[PDB]
């Protein structure tokens, strides 16, 4: 026996209205409501759709679970300074209130008139928390756009730390039409512990971040995909299709259980 309503009574629930937890951290037009909220269990609706620029996340499974298990959506505003470039590039596929907008937590760079010189900027972390930086690399659908946006045929993105380094040179190719845009973005992540530094260096094709996140690891936070909505009853246990409020330790309902719940 199970209830058809999710009840948060002691736990902390967040309704991901039109936003997957990954697009929620990027700052898509529909994901303004989620920003600035902690949670123990994030409900991810299967009706969540893409709204902004078409993109793809290598190792998407890791970034999804890491963002989930921390339970903190607070964003630290860190002022980056970019040299001899034009920032705040917007897109038409990413429409926010019918104004040509971009990711609320990201920054798109383009050359100004005649050049895109070598960028060299660092931010050493000495805080009492680990920092998560979310950045992307833009792939032009034509070689001609590669010189109009970034004034370089061999673009490059090299985001390094004290232990790792990831050098990516974008590949140019025509992708199928996704909201009238044949260009894709590859998003990567790099975690910086206290006493570690993060370096940014790009001769072209960078989706720069407007800051970083706060990381509280080894904390109880998880995610769940379901269509059942939230109710108003009292329970510490939630399953794949409802809440369970029984005392019998053996209940045959589901295998996905969160909390102090009776076994299979």
């Amino acid at each position, epitope marked *: 026996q199970h209830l058809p309503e999710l009840c948060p009574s002691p736990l902390r629930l967040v309704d991901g209205q039109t936003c997957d937890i990954v697009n929620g951290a990027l700052g898509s037009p529909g994901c303004d409501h989620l920003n600035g909220a902690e949670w123990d269990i994030f409900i991810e609706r299967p009706t969540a759709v893409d709204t902004c620029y078409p993109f793809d996340v290598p190792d998407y499974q890791s970034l999804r679970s890491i963002l989930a298990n921390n339970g903190k959506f607070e964003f630290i505003a860190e002022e980056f300074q970019w040299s001899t470039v*034009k*920032q705040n*590039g*917007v897109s038409a596929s990413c429409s926010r209130a019918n104004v040509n907008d971009f990711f609320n937590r990201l920054n798109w760079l*383009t050359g100004k008139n005649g050049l895109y010189p070598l960028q060299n900027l660092t931010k050493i972390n000495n805080g009492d928390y680990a920092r998560l930086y979310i950045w992307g690399v833009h792939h032009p659908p034509n070689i*001609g756009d590669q010189t*109009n*946006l970034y004034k370089n045929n061999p673009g490059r993105v090299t985001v390094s730390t004290k232990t790792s380094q990831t050098s990516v040179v974008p590949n140019i190719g025509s992708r199928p039409k996704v909201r009238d845009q044949e260009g894709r973005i590859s998003f990567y992540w790099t975690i910086v512990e206290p006493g570690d530094l993060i370096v940014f260096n790009t001769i072209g094709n960078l989706i720069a971040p407007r800051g970083h996140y706060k990381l509280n690891s080894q904390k109880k936070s998880t995610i769940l995909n379901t269509a059942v909505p939230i109710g108003s009853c009292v329970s510490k246990c939630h399953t794949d299709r409802g809440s369970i409020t029984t005392t019998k330790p053996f209940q045959n309902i589901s295998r996905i259980s969160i909390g102090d719940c009776p076994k299979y």
Partner: antibody
Amino acid sequence: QVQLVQSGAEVKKPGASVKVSCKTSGYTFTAYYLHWVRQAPGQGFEWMAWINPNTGDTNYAQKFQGRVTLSRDTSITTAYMELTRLRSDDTAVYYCAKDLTLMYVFDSGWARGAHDYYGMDVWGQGTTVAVSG
Amino acid sequence: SALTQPASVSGSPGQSVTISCTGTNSDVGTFDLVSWYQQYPGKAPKLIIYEGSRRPSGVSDRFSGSKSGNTASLTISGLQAEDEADYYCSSYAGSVVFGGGTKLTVLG
């Protein structure tokens, strides 16, 4: 090779209306702004208004707000500039010029945040307009 | 919105000529990135330097501009040969501002 063609010289009696056409070639007409500026005999240049070829947005000067009116044609790149209620004062060589700033990239869907002025790199050959009663 | 220029500049061939540019209080001191032009008699003007110091494809290295506080200058250091023309200047002060214009005279 970039060139700007302007309509021929015209003479109007005061109080009439004038319409000048500028036809671009060799560049994407919708990827740049468009300016209109006049130069009086023995005088300097004086800017009037700009127009957005991709959206049709316009912004006039106070001296010409209510008389001038711009228009754009997506096919064949011809821009226009109609001035109503002209007077004997307005005797000048009217120029059409493209701004250097690129604002849109249609394949990659990119757009510039706002507009900044840097320079008018291409100018039309000029339309000599005479207004005498 | 003034962007005042000298009325004339006289110079001997082989030397350099400087044409300065000044406006009013904080009108030109606005992240200058100024532009310049060269207009021959009875001809359309051409853009010679944009962003104060950079040249486009075609202008020889003889044309140059520099930052001097509130003043912006232009130097023509080559053997002047056909530089006799009216030189104008333009910046942005709410609505793109134009200078009066300076005529260069080749010596004879």
